[PDB]
A paper describes a structure:
Here we focus on three structurally distinct cell surface receptors: the fibronectin-leucine-rich transmembrane (FLRT) proteins, the Latrophilins (ADGRL, Lphn, Lec) and the uncoordinated-5 (Unc5 and Unc-5) receptors. Most protein–protein interactions shown for FLRT involve the LRR domain, which promotes cell adhesion via interaction with itself (homophilic)2 or with Latrophilin7, and triggers cell repulsion by binding Unc5 receptors. We find that while FLRT2–Latrophilin3 and FLRT2–Unc5D complexes consist of 1:1 dimers, complexes of FLRT2, Unc5D and Latrophilin3 ectodomains form large assemblies containing two copies of Latrophilin3 for each copy of FLRT2 and Unc5D.
The crystals diffracted up to 6 Å maximum resolution. The resulting structure revealed an unexpected stoichiometry, in which each copy of FLRT2LRR binds one copy of Unc5DIg and two copies of Lphn3Lec–Olf. Within each tetramer, Unc5DIg is bound to FLRT2LRR in the same orientation as the 1:1 complex structure we solved previously (root mean squared deviation is 0.7 Å for 423 aligned Cα atoms). The Olf domain of one Lphn3Lec–Olf molecule (Lphn3ALec–Olf) occupies a binding site on the concave surface of FLRT2LRR, which has previously been identified as the FLRT2 dimerization surface. We termed this loop the ‘DDD loop' as it contains three consecutive aspartate residues: D397, D398 and D399. The DDD loop was unresolved in our previous high-resolution crystal structures of Lphn3Lec–Olf alone, suggesting that it only becomes ordered on engagement with FLRT2LRR/Lphn3A as found in the complex.
Numbering used by the authors:
A (entry chain C): 100 to 464
B (entry chain A): 46 to 151
C (entry chain B): 36 to 361
D (entry chain D): 202 to 464
């Protein structure tokens, strides 16, 4: 077992070629006599962090050596004005990794039509499934201008078509756009008339955080082609959680940044050459951006679109021009989001609720 | 005969700090005032929380009002906003309204 | 095209550039103008901006203003003046924008006295109006006749006059939630004159019973949450034959008089969570009503609080035929 | 020993209103004693079992002794078998055997391909991926595998050797189910409406049954009593033939009716 006081990095190492297997991780205070600081901070011995195991598992597991910095950069603060410690128990298991679910499928080649659910009453909307949790739960947020604030849960695929809702979550702050995503039983919905990402846990039905995206344009300043205050899109892939936005420093062009789901901070910034208003939608797959360009209702002397014409890698920091055909059966595309578990696209296109199938290559790089 | 003007703050709210879970209240004084209410983190505070005291100052001519609001440790730790727990105060008069300093409870 | 500002196609970007005044070089082919998150004051507004007829949408949120801006573009439909400090509203500043339809004035310092008599009425084409998180003590009098959506929530409103809701016959949604309103503060039949009203919400207020005399001609949604309602009268819900959604949750209700929901035929949903429902002989109508209710109408929230023998239980199902009660 | 096939579940006893929204309570059927084993459920903090001398001491609040468990408990699947507590270990698919008499661990069994830690729990969740049931046949493990596509999988576990003595796969999904209990090697799946689900109005009834001896499934319609909405755990006791149901903050005991319809 390993222990470390606040603002100090913890060192975990397995002998030979073995792998660290985390059993119990608690970032807080259970016993007062452990840390030696000030008695005014040792008064509360009821500090606990449930997310601590999930944080360490992403780093310490599958590796031989891991140095985690026990501070506000990796671990979010549970209670203010209390000195914290990290109690991590671990075993020595062989170097066997789990495939398919965490692994990259390859560089995208074709975006084809999959399922056609219901022709919903709302024109502009979005719908997404929680990839981390192994459940058939379908979230549903229909966007209305200056009136969106209610998330609608569904038990199965059959209950989503027929119209049988499980429960409805009452969101305190108003939603701004169709860029909504769910990550490990929590909603990363964007706030109205602000550049802040509101984190809302579905299990507890209370707000857990709010992160300010630096220099990001908000409230119809730099939305997609159709508009609708879609200035911020939230994509989930094999790498983790991502924020698709636009800054004036990049002259209205698309800016992509990796956001931590626990600490709610930027873990790298990337600038692209494509303009957000020219783009219809965007989705992340293995840290690679896929810009959608499509035809909409009321287009004077235009027919160009229904294609993927821009790609940007985060690991390589290089951009390329592609020509992958995107399906556009209906003109008014609202939201496009990717799910790494099923490897399918969740698309809202002019009232209709549709699902899209994906094709990849035999080599990514 | 009395002069009518916008509310002028005498005792503006100062930044409070919670020590050993002891709840510390905020002070506010304005003139001419008849109704004084707090706006904690962009939203109004309930009437029952406000403790009004319309004490007429011997120095000043117009009516003076003093309202105090308690800020507990539980209200701060459960708050998960972007900025710190800031408190602003608005006073009422026959001509208009005026806003005071943003006192942040940490 | 300005030097400090960087324009893009049919859009002008002056946002977050620390500007104190609107730039001079404005083209005659721009549709949407962005000037938000700056240090632009009410005095720093050139009159050449008024001449630009092509601009229809102007954004000026999160600035340092004091009064409604002057010399704004002549043919503007949507205007955003939120998160600033406008205290005063004038008749002449709204007469210049005759084509104004949508108007947002959120988080501002707008007071009842500061607003000129009939300033909003000057903007004849005004249908959408937003006066949220302001310092309004009451509802203004000079309101547009063709106004469709009036939002005046999260303010300090305690009194509402009968003449305040005059000529607003063409109003659909009316929001007045998050105020210090009471049943004494509301006039006798003030909302009754709004026949086109489809939605009405007064949540997080101090109402001792639902407001008497309400329009049942077009009303579909009626929200009454976090109030101090002790009881609901038989006439309060009568004639509301077109109502679909009703919510009376987070209230202080013990027993409901029978025949109160008898006139709501179109009702698709009812919510009554967190309420001190004292279950005695008075709840025997609720249990039966919930049993033979059609699938189209959902009713949830009814849970027993008193006595301790039946505490926490669900009103939906009875045990031993409500004891010795029948 | 076999009383028969279940006909209807009815309300019988109401003890007290506990401070916890989730948990379970059970009596040892093998030992002829009035000992009541209490279990309060807390997320990522469950590790203590409380013992009570009689029924009167359980209501008033007089605990006999508290056992300190070596590992954290996951879900509300708590069961007692011949003076030994059987529980599910946190973040693992392992039943852990703990003897109450000696106060030390005696074994740990790995349930093959079983989903664990909020992967495949009940309708309310709370890491209730693995539930333990006791009947006339013996000890049983109610779980779910990905091979059966999230559907309920029931297996008979030996209380001494700690090994699987047969595997049975069902058609009902564990996430759709509220609670499960075994009677004479027959599974009883409960479907119920929970709290904060205002959209729901459907009746709470038993709609799925599965026999182990026959290996055949049928669709039934037995009414289940639901005084409250947050049904945490349901367990059967063959000695008293009563259900130990934990509904919301309250702790209740249900009466059972049996029929002669059985081969
Ligand atoms: C690639 C990968 O993530 N491998 C494993 C994962 O399968 C496992 O779930 C996690 C903790 O259990 O440790 C890691
Ligand atoms: C529990 C508590 O602190 N109550 C305080 C009271 O002591 C104080 O005198 C009053 C001043 O308005 O505000 C309230
Ligand atoms: C501008 C306008 O139409 N004003 C009308 C007025 O003419 C009418 O007499 C009154 C009746 O209540 O309602 C108002
Ligand atoms: Ca997307
Ligand atoms: Ca059970
Ligand atoms: Na999205
Ligand atoms: Na059990």
């Amino acid at each position: 077992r390993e222990l470390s006081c606040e603002s100090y990095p913890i060192e975990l190492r397995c002998p030979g070629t073995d792998v660290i297997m985390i059993e119990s991780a608690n970032y807080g205070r259970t016993d007062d006599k452990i840390c030696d600081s000030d008695p005014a901070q040792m008064e509360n011995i009821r500090c606990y962090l449930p997310d601590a195991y999930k944080i360490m598992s992403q780093r310490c597991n599958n590796r031989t050596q891991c140095a985690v910095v026990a501070g506000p950069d990796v671990f979010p603060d549970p209670c203010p004005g209390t000195y914290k410690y990290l109690e991590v128990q671990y075993e020595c298991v062989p170097y066997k990794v789990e495939q398919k679910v965490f692994l990259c499928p390859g560089l995208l080649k074709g975006v084809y039509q999959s399922e056609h659910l219901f022709e919903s009453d709302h024109q502009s909307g979005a719908w997404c499934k929680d990839p981390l949790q192994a459940s058939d739960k379908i979230y549903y947020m229909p966007w209305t201008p200056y009136r969106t604030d209610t998330l609608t849960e569904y038990s199965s695929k059959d209950d989503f078509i027929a119209g049988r809702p499980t429960t409805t979550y009452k969101l305190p702050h108003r939603v701004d756009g169709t860029g909504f995503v769910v990550y490990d039983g929590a909603l990363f919905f964007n706030k109205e008339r602000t550049r802040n990402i509101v984190k809302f846990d579905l299990r507890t039905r209370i707000k857990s955080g709010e992160a300010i995206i630096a220099n990001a344009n908000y409230h119809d300043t730099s939305p997609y082609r159709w508009g609708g205050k879609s200035d911020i899109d939230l994509a989930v892939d094999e790498n983790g959680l991502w924020v698709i936005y636009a800054t004036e420093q990049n002259n209205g062009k698309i800016v992509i940044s990796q956001l931590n789901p626990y600490t709610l901070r930027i873990e790298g910034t990337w600038d692209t050459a494509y303009d957000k208003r020219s783009a219809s939608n965007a989705f992340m797959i293995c840290g690679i951006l896929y810009v959608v360009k499509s035809v909409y209702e009321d287009d004077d002397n235009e027919a160009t679109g229904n294609k993927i014409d821009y790609i940007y890698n985060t690991d390589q920091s290089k951009d390329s021009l592609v020509d992958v055909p995107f399906p556009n059966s209906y003109q008014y595309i609202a939201a496009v989001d990717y799910n790494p578990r099923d490897n399918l696209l969740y698309v809202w296109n002019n009232y209709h609720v549709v699902k899209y199938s994906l094709d990849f290559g035999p080599l990514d790089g | 005969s009395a002069p009518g003007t916008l509310p002028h703050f005498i005792e503006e709210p100062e930044d409070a700090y919670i020590i050993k879970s002891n709840p510390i209240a905020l002070r506010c004084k304005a003139r001419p005032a008849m109704q004084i209410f707090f706006k904690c983190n962009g939203e109004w505070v309930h009437q029952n929380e406000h403790v009004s005291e319309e004490s007429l100052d011997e120095s000043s001519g117009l009516k003076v009002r003093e309202v105090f609001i308690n800020v507990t440790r539980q209200q701060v730790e459960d708050f998960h906003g972007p900025e710190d727990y800031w408190c602003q105060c608005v006073a009422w008069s026959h001509l208009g309204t005026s806003k005071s300093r943003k006192a942040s409870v940490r | 095209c300005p030097s400090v500002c960087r324009c893009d196609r049919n859009f002008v970007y002056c946002n977050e550039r620390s500007l104190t005044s609107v730039p001079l070089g404005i083209p005659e082919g721009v549709t949407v103008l962005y000037l938000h998150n700056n240090q632009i004051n009410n005095a720093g507004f050139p009159a050449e901006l008024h001449n630009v007829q092509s601009v229809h949408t102007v954004y000026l949120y999160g600035n340092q203003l004091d009064e409604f801006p002057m010399n704004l573009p002549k043919n503007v439909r949507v205007l955003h003046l939120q998160e600033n400090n406008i205290q005063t509203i004038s008749r002449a500043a709204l007469a210049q924008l005759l084509k104004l339809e949508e108007l947002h004035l959120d988080d501002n310092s707008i007071s009842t006295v500061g607003v000129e008599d009939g300033a909003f009425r000057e903007a004849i084409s005004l249908k959408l109006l937003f006066l949220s998180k302001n310092h309004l003590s009451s509802v203004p009098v000079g309101l547009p006749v063709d106004l469709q959506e009036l939002r005046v929530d999260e303010n300090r409103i305690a009194v509402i006059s009968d003449m305040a809701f005059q000529n607003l016959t063409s109003l659909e949604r009316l929001i007045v939630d998050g105020n210090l309103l009471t049943n004494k503060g509301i006039a006798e039949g003030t909302f009754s004159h709004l026949t086109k009203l489809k939605e009405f919400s007064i949540v997080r207020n101090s109402l001792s019973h639902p407001p008497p005399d309400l329009p049942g001609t077009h009303l579909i949604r009626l929200y009454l949450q976090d109030n101090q309602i002790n009881h609901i009268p038989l006439t309060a819900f009568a004639n509301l034959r077109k109502l679909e959604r009703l919510d009376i949750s987070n209230n202080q209700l013990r027993m409901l008089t029978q025949g109160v929901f008898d006139h709501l035929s179109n009702l698709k949903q009812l919510t009554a969570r967190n309420n001190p429902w004292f279950c005695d002989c008075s709840i025997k109508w609720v249990t039966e009503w919930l049993k033979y209710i059609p699938s189209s109408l959902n009713v949830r929230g009814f849970m027993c609080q008193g006595p301790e023998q039946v505490r926490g239980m669900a009103v939906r199902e009875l045990n031993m035929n409500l004891l010795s009660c029948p």
